Amino acid sequence: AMQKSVLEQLKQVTMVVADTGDFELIKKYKPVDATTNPSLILKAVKEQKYSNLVAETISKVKANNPDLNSDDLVKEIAIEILVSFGIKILDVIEGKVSSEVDARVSFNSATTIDYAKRIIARYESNGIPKDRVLIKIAATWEGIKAAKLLQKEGINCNLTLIFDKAQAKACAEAGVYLVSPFVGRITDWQMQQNNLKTFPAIADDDGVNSVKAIYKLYKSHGFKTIVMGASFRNVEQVIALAGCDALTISPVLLEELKNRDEHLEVKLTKNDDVVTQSPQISEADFRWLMNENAMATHKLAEGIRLFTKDTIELENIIKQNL
């Protein structure tokens, strides 16, 4: 782009997003948006780098909530930590930050809505308007149902743990602001199931193909939901999706892209394919389609379990630091 790095070239055709809670690293890549999740928040808390911020948040919450029991206090500290890191991130980017609801409410639309609103309220109390936040929700049928209601009230959501086109279609039909189709975890399944000794070629990469299929689906149907590829194993997977609406990338891979200097060929583009529109997917059809996809059924469930485990670990760290 005047002999620019792959990272700089990529920013011209795709919205680059940093996938991290480590806000000090964000400055060296200059992404538009940033994304966090329970695993990334745990990592930012557990590491010594932001020990002061964590200590201050714990103190503040204890002081402002003297009437809460130990369990309630811990949950309140956990949400303020989520939001505190979100605010530090917003201070270094021009865009939005994604903050994820407690994974334990993934099968309850009502409590997902409650948690989403609590996150928004904590940001508001800290002087941050909702226009800069995306509430991240696991794309289970219940999560999509909750997002549908949240969007009607002007709360933008980021539907995550997307492994199947059926999820992506129901999300778009719910008027969701953005979806995070996973790439890497899909490729993990592929390599284990097929005992692959080396990484699959881009043309054969199940993860890259999933995002390409969702992108095509959305554009051909005129859905305005943002397609953001997430979870990457190498820069080649990211580069293969150049042109996608957005891509959220780890600091490790952003560093690699910053140091790559070959010409970037754009792969995903807009077409003149007359828009087509099908009937919305019902709960029963969605559940059947997800069941037919062994990988998606496993990885959606696993993703929720893993985030739950990391949330429980965070709670234990908080309890040991009261």
Contacts of 304 (CB under 8 A, 6+ apart): 103, 106, 138, 140, 161
The CA distance from 93 to 30, in Å, is 7
Dihedral of the alpha carbons of 215, 221, 223, 228, in degrees to the nearest 10: 0
Query: Would you state the CATH architecture of domain 1-322?
Result: Alpha-Beta Barrel (3.20)
Kindly list the catalytic residues. 136
Q: What is the sign, positive or negative, of the torsion defined by CA atoms of 142, 160, 130, 225?
A: negative
Dihedral of the alpha carbons of 301, 123, 117, 280, in degrees to the nearest 10: -60
3-state secondary structure of 222: coil
Q: Where are the domains of the chain?
A: 1-322
The CA distance from 13 to 26, in Å, is 20
CA–CA–CA angle 57, 59, 60 (5° rounding): 65
Dihedral of the alpha carbons of 235, 190, 230, 161, in degrees to the nearest 10: -170
Provide the b/e sequence for 87-114 (b: ≥16 CB within 10 Å): bbbbebbeebbbbbbbbebbebbebbbe
The CA-atom distances, in angstroms, between 239 and each of 13, 115, 198, 235 are: 11, 35, 18, 6
Burial class (CB in 10 A: 0-12, 13-18, 19+), 272: exposed
Q: Find the helix packing angle between 283-292 and 294-320, rounded to 10°.
A: 100
Q: Which of 262, 272, 222, 221 is nearest to 242 (CA)?
A: 262
